Coordinates of C-alpha atoms in Angstrom, one line a residue:
Chain X
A1175 CA 27.1 151.0 -17.1
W1176 CA 25.5 152.5 -13.6
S1177 CA 23.9 155.7 -15.3
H1178 CA 20.9 156.4 -13.0
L1179 CA 22.3 157.2 -9.3
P1180 CA 22.0 153.9 -7.5
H1181 CA 21.5 153.2 -4.0
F1182 CA 20.3 150.2 -1.9
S1183 CA 17.4 150.0 -4.4
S1184 CA 19.0 150.5 -8.0
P1185 CA 16.1 149.6 -10.4
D1186 CA 17.4 147.4 -12.6
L1187 CA 19.5 146.0 -10.0
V1188 CA 16.3 145.6 -7.6
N1189 CA 15.0 143.5 -10.4
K1190 CA 18.5 141.8 -10.9
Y1191 CA 18.0 140.8 -7.0
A1192 CA 14.3 141.3 -6.0
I1193 CA 14.1 138.3 -3.7
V1194 CA 10.8 138.4 -1.4
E1195 CA 9.7 136.4 1.1
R1196 CA 6.3 135.7 3.1
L1197 CA 5.9 134.7 6.8
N1198 CA 6.3 130.8 6.4
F1199 CA 4.0 128.7 8.7
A1200 CA 7.6 127.6 10.3
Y1201 CA 7.1 131.1 12.2
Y1202 CA 4.1 130.0 14.2
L1203 CA 5.1 126.4 14.1
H1204 CA 8.8 126.8 15.6
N1205 CA 7.8 129.5 17.7
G1206 CA 4.5 127.2 18.3
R1207 CA 1.3 129.0 17.7
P1208 CA -1.0 125.9 17.1
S1209 CA -4.4 127.2 16.2
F1210 CA -3.2 130.5 14.5
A1211 CA -0.6 128.3 13.1
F1212 CA -3.0 126.3 11.0
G1213 CA -5.4 129.0 10.4
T1214 CA -2.9 131.1 8.7
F1215 CA -1.6 128.4 6.7
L1216 CA -5.2 127.8 5.6
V1217 CA -5.4 131.8 5.0
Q1218 CA -2.3 131.9 3.0
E1219 CA -2.5 128.1 1.4
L1220 CA -5.5 126.7 1.5
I1221 CA -7.2 128.7 -1.2
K1222 CA -3.5 129.0 -2.6
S1223 CA -3.3 125.1 -2.8
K1224 CA -3.9 124.2 -6.7
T1225 CA -3.1 121.1 -5.7
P1226 CA -4.6 120.6 -2.2
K1227 CA -3.7 116.7 -2.1
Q1228 CA -0.2 117.3 -3.3
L1229 CA 0.1 120.7 -1.1
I1230 CA -1.2 118.6 1.7
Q1231 CA 1.4 115.9 1.5
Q1232 CA 4.2 118.6 1.0
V1233 CA 3.1 120.2 4.1
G1234 CA 2.9 117.1 6.2
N1235 CA 6.5 116.2 5.2
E1236 CA 7.3 119.8 6.0
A1237 CA 5.7 119.0 9.3
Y1238 CA 7.3 115.9 10.1
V1239 CA 11.0 117.1 9.3
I1240 CA 9.9 120.1 11.9
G1241 CA 9.0 117.7 14.5
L1242 CA 11.8 115.2 14.2
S1243 CA 14.1 118.2 14.1
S1244 CA 13.6 119.1 18.0
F1245 CA 13.3 115.6 19.8
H1246 CA 14.3 117.0 23.4
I1247 CA 12.4 120.4 23.7
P1248 CA 8.9 119.9 25.0
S1249 CA 7.0 122.7 23.3
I1250 CA 8.1 121.8 19.6
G1251 CA 7.1 118.4 19.7
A1252 CA 3.4 119.2 21.4
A1253 CA 3.1 121.9 18.4
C1254 CA 3.9 119.2 16.0
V1255 CA 1.1 116.8 17.4
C1256 CA -1.0 119.6 17.4
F1257 CA -0.1 120.5 13.5
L1258 CA -0.6 117.2 12.4
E1259 CA -3.7 116.6 14.1
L1260 CA -5.1 119.6 12.6
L1261 CA -3.6 118.7 9.1
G1262 CA -5.9 115.6 8.9
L1263 CA -3.5 112.8 8.9
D1264 CA -2.0 109.9 11.0
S1265 CA -0.9 111.1 14.2
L1266 CA 1.5 107.9 15.2
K1267 CA 4.6 108.5 12.9
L1268 CA 5.9 111.4 14.8
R1269 CA 4.6 110.5 18.5
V1270 CA 6.8 107.1 17.6
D1271 CA 10.0 109.1 16.5
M1272 CA 9.6 111.3 19.7
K1273 CA 9.1 108.2 22.0
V1274 CA 11.8 106.5 20.4
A1275 CA 14.4 109.3 20.9
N1276 CA 13.0 109.8 24.1
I1277 CA 13.8 106.5 25.3
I1278 CA 17.0 106.4 23.9
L1279 CA 18.4 108.9 26.5
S1280 CA 19.0 106.5 29.1
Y1281 CA 21.8 104.5 27.8
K1282 CA 23.2 107.1 25.8
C1283 CA 23.6 109.8 28.6
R1284 CA 23.6 107.6 32.0
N1285 CA 26.2 105.2 30.2
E1286 CA 28.2 107.2 28.1
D1287 CA 30.2 110.7 29.3
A1288 CA 29.9 113.6 26.8
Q1289 CA 28.1 116.9 26.6
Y1290 CA 24.4 116.5 25.5
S1291 CA 24.3 118.6 22.7
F1292 CA 27.0 116.6 20.7
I1293 CA 24.9 113.5 21.3
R1294 CA 21.7 115.6 20.3
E1295 CA 23.8 116.7 17.0
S1296 CA 24.6 113.0 16.3
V1297 CA 21.0 111.8 17.2
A1298 CA 19.6 114.2 14.7
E1299 CA 22.0 113.0 12.3
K1300 CA 21.0 109.5 12.8
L1301 CA 17.4 110.6 12.6
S1302 CA 17.3 112.3 9.2
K1303 CA 19.3 109.2 8.3
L1304 CA 16.6 107.0 9.2
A1305 CA 14.2 109.4 7.5
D1306 CA 16.1 108.4 4.2
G1307 CA 15.1 105.0 5.1
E1308 CA 18.3 103.5 5.8
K1309 CA 17.3 99.7 7.0
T1310 CA 20.9 99.0 8.4
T1311 CA 20.7 102.5 10.2
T1312 CA 17.2 101.7 11.0
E1313 CA 18.3 98.2 12.8
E1314 CA 21.2 99.6 14.5
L1315 CA 18.7 102.5 16.4
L1316 CA 16.6 99.6 17.1
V1317 CA 18.9 97.6 18.6
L1318 CA 20.0 100.4 20.8
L1319 CA 16.4 101.0 21.7
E1320 CA 16.3 97.4 22.7
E1321 CA 19.5 97.9 24.6
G1322 CA 18.3 101.0 26.6
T1323 CA 15.0 99.5 27.1
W1324 CA 16.4 96.6 28.8
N1325 CA 18.5 99.0 31.0
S1326 CA 15.6 101.3 31.9
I1327 CA 13.4 98.1 32.8
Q1328 CA 16.3 97.1 35.2
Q1329 CA 16.1 100.5 36.7
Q1330 CA 12.9 100.0 38.0
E1331 CA 13.8 97.4 39.8
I1332 CA 11.4 94.8 38.7
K1333 CA 11.3 91.5 37.4
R1334 CA 12.5 91.5 34.0
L1335 CA 9.8 89.9 32.5
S1336 CA 6.7 90.5 34.6
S1337 CA 3.4 91.8 33.4
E1338 CA 4.2 95.9 33.7
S1339 CA 7.5 94.5 31.9
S1340 CA 5.5 93.8 28.3
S1341 CA 3.9 97.0 29.3
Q1342 CA 6.6 98.9 29.0
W1343 CA 7.9 96.7 25.9
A1344 CA 5.1 97.3 24.0
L1345 CA 6.7 100.1 21.9
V1346 CA 9.6 97.6 21.3
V1347 CA 7.1 96.2 18.7
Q1348 CA 5.3 99.6 18.1
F1349 CA 8.3 100.5 16.6
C1350 CA 9.5 98.1 14.6
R1351 CA 6.0 97.6 13.1
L1352 CA 5.6 101.3 12.5
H1353 CA 8.8 101.6 10.4
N1354 CA 8.3 98.5 8.4
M1355 CA 10.9 96.1 10.1
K1356 CA 11.1 92.5 10.5
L1357 CA 9.6 92.0 13.9
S1358 CA 12.7 91.5 16.3
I1359 CA 12.3 88.7 18.8
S1360 CA 13.0 90.9 22.1
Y1361 CA 11.3 89.2 25.1
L1362 CA 10.1 85.8 23.5
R1363 CA 13.6 84.6 23.7
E1364 CA 14.2 86.3 27.3
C1365 CA 10.9 84.4 28.4
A1366 CA 12.2 81.5 26.6
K1367 CA 15.3 80.7 28.4
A1368 CA 13.8 80.9 31.8
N1369 CA 11.0 78.3 31.2
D1370 CA 7.8 80.5 31.2
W1371 CA 5.2 78.9 29.1
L1372 CA 2.3 81.4 30.0
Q1373 CA 4.4 84.1 28.7
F1374 CA 5.3 82.5 25.2
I1375 CA 1.8 81.9 25.0
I1376 CA 0.4 85.2 25.8
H1377 CA 2.8 87.4 24.7
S1378 CA 3.2 85.7 21.4
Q1379 CA -0.3 86.4 20.9
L1380 CA -1.3 89.6 21.4
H1381 CA 0.8 91.1 18.8
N1382 CA 0.4 88.5 16.3
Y1383 CA 3.7 86.7 16.1
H1384 CA 4.3 85.5 12.6
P1385 CA 3.8 81.5 13.1
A1386 CA 7.7 80.9 11.8
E1387 CA 9.1 82.9 14.4
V1388 CA 7.3 81.1 17.5
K1389 CA 8.0 77.4 16.4
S1390 CA 11.7 78.5 15.4
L1391 CA 12.4 80.1 18.9
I1392 CA 10.7 77.1 20.7
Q1393 CA 14.3 75.5 20.7
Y1394 CA 15.3 77.3 23.5
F1395 CA 13.3 76.2 26.5
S1396 CA 14.0 72.8 28.1
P1397 CA 14.0 68.8 28.0
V1398 CA 10.5 68.9 29.2
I1399 CA 7.9 71.3 27.8
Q1400 CA 9.8 71.1 24.9
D1401 CA 8.3 67.8 23.5
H1402 CA 4.7 68.8 24.7
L1403 CA 5.2 72.2 22.9
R1404 CA 6.9 71.2 19.6
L1405 CA 3.9 68.8 18.9
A1406 CA 1.5 71.1 20.5
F1407 CA 0.6 73.2 17.5
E1408 CA 2.5 71.2 14.9
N1409 CA -0.2 72.3 12.6
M1438 CA 16.6 60.9 11.6
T1439 CA 19.5 59.4 13.0
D1440 CA 18.3 56.2 14.7
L1441 CA 17.7 52.8 12.9
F1442 CA 14.8 52.2 15.3
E1443 CA 13.1 55.5 13.7
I1444 CA 14.1 55.4 10.2
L1445 CA 12.7 51.9 9.4
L1446 CA 9.6 52.9 11.9
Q1447 CA 9.0 55.9 9.7
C1448 CA 9.7 54.0 6.6
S1449 CA 6.1 52.7 6.5
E1450 CA 5.1 55.8 4.9
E1451 CA 6.1 56.0 1.5
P1452 CA 4.8 54.9 -1.8
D1453 CA 5.9 51.5 -0.7
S1454 CA 9.3 51.5 1.0
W1455 CA 11.6 50.6 -2.0
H1456 CA 12.8 54.5 -2.3
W1457 CA 12.8 56.2 0.7
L1458 CA 15.1 54.1 2.5
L1459 CA 17.5 54.1 -0.2
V1460 CA 17.2 57.9 -1.1
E1461 CA 17.9 58.1 2.9
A1462 CA 20.8 55.9 2.7
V1463 CA 22.6 57.1 -0.2
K1464 CA 22.9 60.4 1.1
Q1465 CA 24.4 59.5 4.4
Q1466 CA 27.0 56.9 3.8
Chain K
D667 CA 44.8 141.8 -14.7
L668 CA 42.1 142.6 -12.3
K669 CA 40.9 139.2 -12.1
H670 CA 44.7 138.1 -10.8
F671 CA 43.8 139.0 -7.2
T672 CA 40.6 137.4 -7.4
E682 CA 30.5 143.1 8.0
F683 CA 33.8 144.5 9.1
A684 CA 33.5 146.3 5.8
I685 CA 30.1 147.3 6.9
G686 CA 32.5 149.4 9.4
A687 CA 35.7 149.7 7.7
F688 CA 34.3 151.2 4.2
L689 CA 31.2 153.4 6.3
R690 CA 34.1 154.4 8.4
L691 CA 36.0 156.8 5.2
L692 CA 32.8 157.0 4.0
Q693 CA 31.3 159.2 6.6
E694 CA 35.0 161.0 6.9
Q695 CA 34.4 162.0 3.3
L696 CA 31.0 163.3 4.2
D697 CA 32.0 165.1 7.4
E698 CA 34.9 166.8 5.6
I699 CA 32.7 167.7 3.2
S700 CA 30.3 169.0 5.6
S701 CA 33.1 171.2 7.2
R725 CA 22.1 165.8 -5.1
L726 CA 24.5 165.5 -1.8
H727 CA 21.5 165.4 0.1
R728 CA 19.9 162.9 -2.0
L729 CA 23.2 161.1 -1.8
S730 CA 23.3 161.1 1.7
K731 CA 19.8 160.4 2.1
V732 CA 20.8 157.0 0.5
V733 CA 23.4 156.7 2.8
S734 CA 21.4 158.0 5.6
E735 CA 19.5 154.8 6.1
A736 CA 22.7 152.5 5.9
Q737 CA 24.9 152.7 9.0
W738 CA 21.9 151.4 11.7
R739 CA 20.6 148.9 8.9
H740 CA 24.4 148.1 8.5
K741 CA 24.7 147.8 11.8
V742 CA 20.9 145.8 11.8
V743 CA 22.2 143.7 9.0
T744 CA 25.2 143.0 11.0
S745 CA 23.3 142.7 13.9
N746 CA 21.0 140.4 11.9
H747 CA 24.0 138.3 10.5
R748 CA 25.4 138.3 14.4
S749 CA 21.9 137.3 15.5
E750 CA 22.7 133.9 13.7
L825 CA 25.3 138.5 0.5
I826 CA 24.5 142.1 -0.7
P827 CA 21.3 139.6 -1.4
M828 CA 21.0 139.8 2.4
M829 CA 21.4 143.4 2.4
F830 CA 18.6 144.1 0.1
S831 CA 15.8 143.0 1.5
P832 CA 12.6 144.6 0.9
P833 CA 11.3 146.5 3.8
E834 CA 8.6 143.7 4.3
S835 CA 11.5 141.2 4.1
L836 CA 13.5 143.7 6.1
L837 CA 11.2 143.4 9.0
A838 CA 10.9 139.4 8.1
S839 CA 14.4 139.3 9.0
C840 CA 14.0 141.4 11.7
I841 CA 11.7 139.1 13.1
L842 CA 13.6 136.2 12.1
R843 CA 15.6 135.9 15.1
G844 CA 12.3 136.7 17.2
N845 CA 13.8 140.2 18.9
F846 CA 11.3 143.0 19.1
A847 CA 13.8 145.7 20.5
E848 CA 16.3 145.8 17.3
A849 CA 13.3 145.7 15.1
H850 CA 11.5 148.5 16.6
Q851 CA 14.1 150.9 15.0
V852 CA 13.4 149.6 11.7
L853 CA 9.5 150.0 12.1
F854 CA 9.9 153.6 13.0
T855 CA 12.5 154.2 10.4
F856 CA 11.2 152.1 7.4
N857 CA 9.0 154.8 6.1
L858 CA 5.8 152.2 6.7
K859 CA 3.7 150.7 9.4
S860 CA 1.2 148.5 7.6
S861 CA 2.0 144.8 8.1
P862 CA 0.2 142.5 10.6
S863 CA 3.9 142.0 12.1
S864 CA 3.0 145.1 14.0
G865 CA 0.7 142.6 16.2
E866 CA 3.2 139.9 15.9
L867 CA 5.6 142.4 17.8
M868 CA 3.0 143.1 20.2
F869 CA 2.3 139.5 20.8
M870 CA 6.3 138.9 20.9
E871 CA 6.5 141.4 23.6
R872 CA 3.7 140.7 25.4
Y873 CA 3.3 136.8 25.5
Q874 CA 7.1 136.6 26.3
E875 CA 6.8 138.2 29.9
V876 CA 3.4 136.5 30.1
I877 CA 5.1 133.2 29.8
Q878 CA 7.8 134.2 32.2
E879 CA 5.2 135.2 34.8
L880 CA 3.2 131.8 34.2
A881 CA 6.2 129.7 34.0
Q882 CA 6.9 131.2 37.9
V883 CA 3.5 131.1 38.9
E884 CA 3.3 127.1 38.1
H885 CA 6.3 126.2 40.6
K886 CA 4.9 128.7 42.8
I887 CA 1.6 127.3 43.0
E888 CA 3.4 123.7 43.3
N889 CA 5.8 125.0 46.2
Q890 CA 2.8 126.6 48.1
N891 CA 0.9 123.0 47.8
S892 CA 4.3 121.7 48.7
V921 CA -2.7 132.0 41.9
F922 CA -5.8 131.2 39.6
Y923 CA -6.7 135.0 39.5
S924 CA -3.3 135.9 38.7
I925 CA -2.9 133.4 35.6
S926 CA -6.5 134.7 34.3
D927 CA -4.9 138.4 34.5
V928 CA -2.0 137.1 32.9
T929 CA -4.1 135.8 30.1
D930 CA -6.2 138.4 29.5
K931 CA -3.1 140.8 29.3
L932 CA -3.0 139.1 25.9
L933 CA -6.7 138.4 25.7
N934 CA -7.5 142.3 26.5
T935 CA -5.4 145.2 25.1
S936 CA -4.8 147.9 27.2
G937 CA -4.5 150.3 24.8
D938 CA -5.0 149.9 21.0
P939 CA -6.2 146.5 19.9
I940 CA -4.0 143.6 18.9
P941 CA -4.0 143.2 15.1
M942 CA -4.8 139.6 15.8
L943 CA -7.5 140.5 18.5
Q944 CA -9.9 141.1 15.5
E945 CA -11.8 137.6 14.7
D946 CA -12.7 138.4 10.7
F947 CA -9.0 139.7 10.8
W948 CA -8.6 136.2 9.8
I949 CA -11.4 136.6 7.6
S950 CA -9.7 139.9 6.4
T951 CA -6.9 137.9 5.7
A952 CA -9.0 135.9 3.3
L953 CA -9.0 137.7 -0.3
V954 CA -11.5 135.7 -1.8
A958 CA -14.4 129.1 -1.7
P959 CA -15.4 125.5 -0.9
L960 CA -13.4 125.9 2.3
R961 CA -14.7 129.3 3.6
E962 CA -17.3 127.5 5.1
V963 CA -14.2 125.4 6.7
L964 CA -13.0 128.7 7.6
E965 CA -16.1 129.5 9.2
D966 CA -15.4 126.9 12.0
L967 CA -12.3 129.1 12.9
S968 CA -11.9 130.9 16.3
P969 CA -9.2 133.5 15.3
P970 CA -9.8 134.8 19.6
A971 CA -8.7 131.1 20.5
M972 CA -6.4 130.9 17.1
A973 CA -3.6 132.3 19.7
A974 CA -5.1 130.9 22.9
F975 CA -5.1 127.5 22.2
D976 CA -1.5 127.9 20.9
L977 CA -0.7 129.6 24.2
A978 CA -2.2 127.0 26.3
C979 CA 0.8 124.7 24.4
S980 CA 3.1 127.4 24.7
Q981 CA 4.2 126.1 28.0
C982 CA 1.1 125.0 30.2
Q983 CA 2.5 122.6 32.7
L984 CA 0.6 122.0 36.0
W985 CA -2.7 120.1 36.8
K986 CA -4.9 123.1 37.6
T987 CA -2.8 125.1 35.3
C988 CA -4.0 122.7 32.4
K989 CA -7.5 122.8 33.9
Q990 CA -7.7 126.5 33.7
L991 CA -5.7 126.9 30.3
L992 CA -8.6 124.8 28.6
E993 CA -11.5 126.3 30.7
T994 CA -10.7 130.0 29.7
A995 CA -10.4 129.1 26.0
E996 CA -13.5 127.3 26.3
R997 CA -15.1 130.6 27.6
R998 CA -13.5 132.2 24.5
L999 CA -14.9 129.4 22.4
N1000 CA -18.4 130.0 23.6
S1001 CA -18.0 134.0 23.2
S1002 CA -16.7 133.1 19.8
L1003 CA -20.2 131.0 19.1
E1004 CA -22.3 133.8 20.6
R1005 CA -20.7 136.3 18.3
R1006 CA -20.6 133.6 15.5
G1007 CA -24.5 133.1 16.1
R1008 CA -24.6 129.9 14.4
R1009 CA -25.6 126.4 15.3
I1010 CA -22.8 123.5 15.7
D1011 CA -22.9 122.0 12.5
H1012 CA -21.1 118.5 14.2
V1013 CA -22.3 116.3 11.2
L1014 CA -20.4 118.9 9.0
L1015 CA -17.7 116.7 7.8
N1016 CA -14.8 118.3 5.5
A1017 CA -14.7 117.0 2.3
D1018 CA -11.3 119.2 2.2
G1019 CA -9.8 117.6 5.0
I1020 CA -10.6 119.5 8.0
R1021 CA -10.8 117.6 11.3
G1022 CA -12.6 120.2 13.2
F1023 CA -11.5 123.3 14.8
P1024 CA -13.7 123.2 17.9
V1025 CA -13.9 119.4 17.3
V1026 CA -10.3 118.9 18.0
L1027 CA -10.9 121.5 20.8
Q1028 CA -13.6 119.2 22.4
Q1029 CA -11.3 116.3 21.7
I1030 CA -8.6 117.3 24.0
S1031 CA -11.0 118.3 26.4
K1032 CA -12.8 115.3 26.8
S1033 CA -9.5 113.3 27.0
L1034 CA -8.3 115.1 29.6
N1035 CA -11.1 114.8 31.3

């Protein structure tokens, strides 16, 4: 029963549908109004932030979402960085995301024929998927990163494993660590097949290659510079050996028998 | 049973509505007044949807102006501003900026490539800067510094806010708008630095550098100088 002559603002109906909104920080950020963005955000929310830690974390999550939304566009990325810095948090997650998406261009565009916008939509979907912590999708994304990185390295027309090679390759470790994924064996092998020790030493070192991986991948080099290496940092099937190394047991009467019962 | 059977409307229904209204013309004034604001809004609301329910069609004049700014279009919103029977919101200054800084950015964007090709200007860039920094007519609603403090309806972070530079609060923003040339970065930093110096002189306060913020502010001028020295 609409007794009162109602209009676009019938009081009872107006209450039934009073839905107001404030100029949320997305206005400035999405436009790109950095210092004003932070300042207006504080004006509206800092006092209003009855839960400063919780509200700050929520705003950071929003900032990360916003940034991830706009990989290609430059201005949005710069705004994201500035707002994160003014927020008071880390400035490496968003930058890592940006660098990864940017470097993924070459061997997705100069190798595949499609409209860049569909590629952008696919990349954004994959990015949101990664934000969900999709470990399998994370692995696929890093794999593509390696592939495109190899393509780009080749493009510059230099030796595939020189110094500047590692210089560009740093991001390979950077991403994997940043996303808490197992350090992928990227260039260690690529130098391992080529018999270049003074790269498997250094580049093993300056990222803290965990001691299992270096030894495990050591078995690719050569006949020579392989025995001088497996024993380098250590810390059978031959009767002249099974008995030579049988002077080590409790006495003997069980190592030989235990070894000989197993293999007939 | 009625339930058995259960913008184009914004045209069609309004058609016969105005048809009956004109036929009668050949309470009602109150009734017409209610429908007086519709078609333009109906257009504008359709213009709103076309830009991108009756819940969308019942936004408060504040929320109405909000949707008007949503797409970032000022010309269409101008009529809503004129006929909204209200002219009290910082969004007025926001429209000011959207109208001015837009062409400002276009001119700056051309100026950069022009400068490079000539090398293959600073005074004009500074003039474009002042075009936002200085207002020919009425002052920009954000042009006031304590206008930010005006937005404060009140704390521990008030002192943090005392580190703010509203005159630069958009200046650094615009420097990040699209500044994309070497000397262009140099100037877009140096002029904003002049603005910061003017802010401090207006501030009349010392640089409490050691004044670390417990709430989690990393330093407005501090971040500014961080970027400055990093560029250096």
